[PDB]
Design a protein around this nucleic acid. Structure first.
Lengths: 192, 135, 164, 131, 86, 90
RNA sequence: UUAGCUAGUUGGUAAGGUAACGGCUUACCAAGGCAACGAUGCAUAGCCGACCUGAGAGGGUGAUCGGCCACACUGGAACUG
RNA sequence: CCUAAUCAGAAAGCCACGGCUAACUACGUGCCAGCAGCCGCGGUAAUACGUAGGUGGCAAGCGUUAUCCGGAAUUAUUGGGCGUAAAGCGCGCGUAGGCGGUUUUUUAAGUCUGAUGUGAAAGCCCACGGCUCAACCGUGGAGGGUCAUUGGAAACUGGAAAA
């Protein structure tokens, strides 16, 4: 159950962007609903980080606690890890219009991480790595459609747009990653 | 207490007790002793199906049944769900769990595993009470 | 003592009870509610009050909250050291933490510490589970908490020879 | 019969804190003089003055108090008490209150504060925390 | 072979009422896993004399020798202190 | 009755044998005495193999019968050359 | 709410026997030995590296995997080696 | 395993929605049927029974049951108490035991400290490498003794001797 939902109703709940948005989903949606307790705030933050990349919880906890291994602060490490996934590297660099397009691009295998075939969106990208587009498939309608627009480029990731080659450079952070979030609540959620 | 007074006694605990006092099953056959075999559930032949009522403040004709188990013990267990496809001499699988209706019954059978067939009168709690997904 | 509405503030309610006074004939009730008040930058205070309605009672609690105030000795987004709070069997225990951990505690004491501007801190409630006593014990622990400069002035020696 | 003199001195010190009196009187001892000297060297004791009369002691110490009459410590107690004696290695030696407080510890070479005891990589039997 | 300085255990005598054999009471004190305090529990090592040389109440040390009889192993090496009623 | 032999340790498809001294009565994957080296049939042609070649000479000089498999690797290494240079010299 | 247990037991001598020391077994002499710091009995149980849990001290378990032990329808015995 | 070709067409559900605990509306029912881990619902307008819609959690898994730990500081050495809440026996004499006034000298058993051997390997942790990644495996490291031997210290505990 990686992704087969509308993914808008959830964003309607969370108030986040990857007419109808002022309301709440469902019949009892648009009118007054319950308040938010601390547990609800923490769950909301968890979902607001998880549905962003479309991965699952049994993977979420593992990704969370493999970020608990290295030194430094905990949250920042968690986000620099979860934005170090393959789909984050593909989309946040500008090879798509949303996060799920990257998932279908990687599971298809259109990308060539280190110029090699890979069939998982969960691989961990690393510095000193490049990424290609399986040059045989560098000219489909969707790919060249998405690349032309200079949507955005952070300074820890590069481009040669005509060559369609991205590459990791430096460890990112919340300062270089858009869609900024709260770290204390989400780490506190996995305490109790 | 003082440290030496604590050395010369092992700091005894308040060891708990079981909630399913027939979680245990005695030696089946070829023996007279009772084994400590543990199980999450036991089968059994029901020698009578009856019905009783709880104490105050609840009021309802609650349906129960006494069952002879594999370990040749005698317990009581109420049948949940709508409708019961049991009677005397009916074998049945049994779970564990207490009900506050009245003591002398602290189990409840499982619906759909044994002779006790699942009731298809439900569509929401189907994975319990033996109901299968309808189409 | 010396309430101020000049700084920024963040009202935060801990609990509400329906509390009753029995008389001949009917049965009179009067809602109650406790609150904690702080600017989450190093200043905090709790509050209590009672009224026949929710908003008036919580307003009373808040207006009485600013009148009792706490200096909150803080350092590096954490408490300077570890302590144990004790007030009327409502014991409580706090301990500093490496950055990135976050406040972990009970609901009321989480609200107390989140609203006093502490980011990363370790603690666990003990003894009684009623919010009021453990919150008051938490504040008592913050009252008898000291920092390096608060002690280095007292002792004849200085900081940089004794430091966390 | 008195089971422990260190317990007596620390109870005298704390009971002097609760009422605040500059002067106190207590039968001295070599370990008592040394720990009093270290107390003065931390900064908690204003002055030290040993006296002699038949036979031991009696160690008279001058307390310390802040300008607003504020007690310097927030607690004081021992760790090594009879029946359950305790010891502490050099690395395992505890940092009570870190720099804030100190940890009096008796070593093969003498009694010193917690710091020097971890610097020299020689531990010993702790006696009392203070903070 | 010569590699062991045999396990020398001091102790005292408890009885002498058997031929060429005594019952040395070795004494030590050992800790507790749960707490960290010390307490002494005794043992009674039987020992092989030559001519019942040791006395009752003596202080002596012993050493590993070999299995000599039914539950008696150690031999004496040197009597430490011998005296009369104190 | 002690011989150089291998103890496989890999999981399902990439086995990882170990070079180690052992008695023939012991299980292949049971107890051992002292480890020397290891073995790996995968990831490289020629494979990657390590060897003590300092205390391994001790066990060959005081007695052991390495299998012909071990003969292959040690002859490729040439320490068994020094072993026979020590033996057949006199 | 398991308080006395032990008579080859404990010690010696001699011999035999065992790869070996040894009441290991014999005959003689002696009455000691074990036990509140828990003998003996009863009941259960193979043990361990570890596994699970816990912040930590601890608590529970002995499935795979490796080490040691005990056993091969039940009881007794011995040849080979 | 790879090449090339073809189709979104074969591939998704389970629990819960009064509080705890994130998630409400209608109808049926009306102390009946039933729910129930607890507090507890239902005798005619049930957000708690059943059903429908909607929603939340989770997922090729999900819920129940049994068992164990945590929570449980509810065996409390770290980390509990004994006026009234369970807990000071009726008290006395006293063995074994536990504990120990002040100072000096001395021993170095405890203690502290260094080395040596050892605590198999696998495992836990750390770092790296290899199976497309992860799982896993390997490598190496640290860690692990209430461990033994031995070189030093003597404040403290202990042994001896002297005030």
């Amino acid at each position: 159950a990686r992704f087969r939902g509308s993914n808008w109703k959830k964003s309607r709940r969370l108030g986040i962007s990857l007419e109808k948005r002022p309301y709440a989903p469902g019949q009892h949606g648009p009118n007054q609903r319950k308040k938010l307790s601390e547990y609800g705030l923490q769950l909301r933050e968890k979902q607001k980080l998880r549905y962003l990349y479309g991965m699952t919880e049994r993977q979420f906890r593992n990704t969370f606690d493999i970020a608990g291994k290295k030194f430094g602060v905990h949250g920042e490490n968690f986000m620099i890890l979860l934005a170090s996934r393959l789909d984050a590297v593909v989309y946040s660099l500008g090879l798509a219009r949303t996060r799920r397009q990257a998932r279908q691009l990687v599971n298809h295998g259109h990308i060539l991480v280190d110029g090699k075939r890979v069939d998982i969106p969960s691989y961990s990208v690393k510095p000193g790595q490049t990424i290609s587009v399986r040059e045989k498939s560098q000219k489909l309608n969707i790919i060249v459609e998405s690349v032309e627009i200079n949507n955005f480029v952070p300074e820890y990731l590069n481009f040669d747009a005509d060559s369609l080659t991205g590459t990791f450079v430096r460890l990112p952070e919340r300062s270089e990653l858009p869609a900024e979030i709260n770290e204390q609540l989400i780490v506190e959620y996995y305490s109790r | 207490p003082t440290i030496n007074q604590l050395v010369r006694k092992p700091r005894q605990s308040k060891i708990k007790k079981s909630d399913s006092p027939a979680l245990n099953k005695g030696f089946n056959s070829k023996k007279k002793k009772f084994t400590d075999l543990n199980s999450p559930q036991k089968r059994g032949v029901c020698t009578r199906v009856g019905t009783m009522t709880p104490r105050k403040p609840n009021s309802a004709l609650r349906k129960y049944a006494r069952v002879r188990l594999s370990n040749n013990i005698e317990i009581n267990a109420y049948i949940p769900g709508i409708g019961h496809n049991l009677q005397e001499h009916s074998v049945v699988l049994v779970r564990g769990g207490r009900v506050r209706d009245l003591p002398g019954v602290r189990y409840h059978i499982v619906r759909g595993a044994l002779d006790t067939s699942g009731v298809d009168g439900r569509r929401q709690g189907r994975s319990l009470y033996g109901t299968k997904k309808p189409k | 003592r010396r309430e101020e509405e000049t700084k920024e503030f963040e009202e935060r309610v801990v609990t509400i009870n329906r509390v009753a006074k029995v008389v001949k004939g009917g049965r009179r009730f009067r809602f109650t509610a406790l609150v904690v008040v702080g600017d989450k930058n190093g200043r905090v205070g709790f509050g209590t009050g009672k009224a026949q309605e929710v908003p008036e009672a919580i307003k009373k609690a808040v207006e009485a909250a600013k009148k009792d105030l706490v200096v909150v000795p803080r350092v590096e987004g954490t408490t300077p050291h570890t302590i144990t709070g004790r007030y009327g069997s409502g014991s409580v225990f706090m301990k500093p933490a490496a950055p990135g951990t976050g406040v972990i505690a009970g609901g009321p004491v989480r609200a107390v510490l989140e609203l006093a501007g502490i980011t990363d801190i370790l603690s666990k409630s003990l003894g009684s589970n009623t919010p009021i006593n453990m919150v008051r014990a938490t504040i008592d622990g913050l009252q008898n908490l000291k920092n390096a400069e608060d002690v280095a002035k007292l002792r004849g020696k200085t900081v940089e020879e004794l430091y966390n | 019969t008195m089971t422990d003199p260190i317990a007596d001195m620390l109870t005298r010190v704390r009971n002097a804190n609760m009422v605040r009196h500059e002067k106190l009187e207590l039968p001295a001892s070599n370990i008592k003089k040394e720990i009093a000297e270290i107390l003065k060297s931390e900064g908690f004791i204003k002055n030290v003055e040993y006296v002699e009369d038949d036979k031991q002691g009696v160690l008279r110490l001058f307390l310390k108090y802040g300008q607003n009459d504020e007690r310097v410590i927030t607690g004081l107690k021992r760790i090594s008490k009879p029946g359950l004696r305790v010891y502490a290695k050099a690395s395992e030696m505890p940092k009570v209150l870190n720099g804030l407080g100190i940890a009096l510890v008796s070593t093969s070479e003498g009694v010193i504060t917690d710091k020097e005891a971890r610097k020299r990589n020689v531990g010993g039997e702790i006696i009392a925390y203070v903070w | 072979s010569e590699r062991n300085d045999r396990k020398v255990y001091v102790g005292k005598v408890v009885s002498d009422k058997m031929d060429k054999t005594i019952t040395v009471l070795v004494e030590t004190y050992k800790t507790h896993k749960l707490y960290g305090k010390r307490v002494k529990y005794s043992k009674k090592y039987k020992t092989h004399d030559e001519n019942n040389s040791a006395k009752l109440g003596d202080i002596v040390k012993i050493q590993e020798t070999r299995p000599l009889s039914a539950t008696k192993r150690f031999r004496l090496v040197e009597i430490v202190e011998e005296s009369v009623i104190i | 009755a002690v011989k150089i032999r291998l103890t496989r340790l890999g999981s399902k498809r990439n086995p990882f044998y170990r070079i180690v001294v052992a008695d023939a009565r012991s299980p292949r994957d049971g107890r051992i005495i002292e480890q020397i080296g290891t073995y790996n049939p995968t990831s490289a042609n020629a494979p990657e193999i390590k060897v003590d070649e300092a205390l391994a000479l001790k066990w060959l000089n005081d007695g052991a019968k390495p299998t012909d498999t071990v003969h292959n690797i040690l002859s490729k290494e040439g320490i068994m050359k020094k072993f026979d240079e020590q033996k057949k010299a006199k």
